């Protein structure tokens, strides 16, 4: 199954999400992560910066936030409304795991 946690890192603000994403899928690993803002139709790629993933906007981000994952093995998962607009530095958001 795919298990994930998202921890909001210091440096995040209304225009910037810095996320420690811990992605667990046996024998696989994360390749891509994208954000879809609430009321938006486009997926915006997060940039991997070492231990964390980042997405910035020129305007405040609109949540709750949805995330699309693509594993190296080509497994797709979408986790919906995982982080609220009014997210909190240092808090972890942990959606239900997704069994294949
Ligand atoms: Cl499973
Ligand atoms: Cl919160
Ligand atoms: Cl799976």
TrEMBL record:
Gene source species: Phleum pratense (Common timothy)
Compartments reported by the entry: Secreted
PROSITE patterns hit by this protein: EXPANSIN_CBD (PS50843)
InterPro entries hit by this protein: Allergen_Lolp2 (IPR005453), Expansin_CBD (IPR007117), Expansin_CBD_sf (IPR036749)
Alphabetical list of Gene3D superfamilies matching this protein: Expansin, cellulose-binding-like domain
Taxonomy of the source species: Eukaryota, Viridiplantae, Streptophyta, Embryophyta, Tracheophyta
GO cellular component, one term: extracellular region
UniProt keyword annotations, A-Z: Secreted
Domain Expansin-like CBD intervals: 15-95
Extent of the signal sequence: none
Family statement drawn from the similarity comment of this UniProt entry: Belongs to the expansin family. Expansin B subfamily.
This protein's record includes keyword Cell membrane: no
Protein name: Phl p 3 allergen
């Amino acid at each position: 199954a795919v298990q994930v946690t998202f921890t909001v890192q210091k440096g995040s603000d209304p225009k910037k999400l810095v996320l420690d994403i811990k992605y667990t899928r046996p024998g696989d690993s994360l390749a891509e992560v994208e954000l879809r803002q609430h009321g938006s139709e486009e997926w915006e790629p997060l940039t991997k910066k070492g231990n964390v993933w980042e997405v910035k906007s020129s305007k405040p981000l609109v949540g709750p936030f949805n995330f699309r994952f693509m594993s190296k093995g080509g497994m797709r998962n979408v986790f919906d409304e995982v982080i609220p607009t009014a997210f909190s530095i240092g808090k972890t958001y942990k959606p239900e795991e997704q069994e294949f």
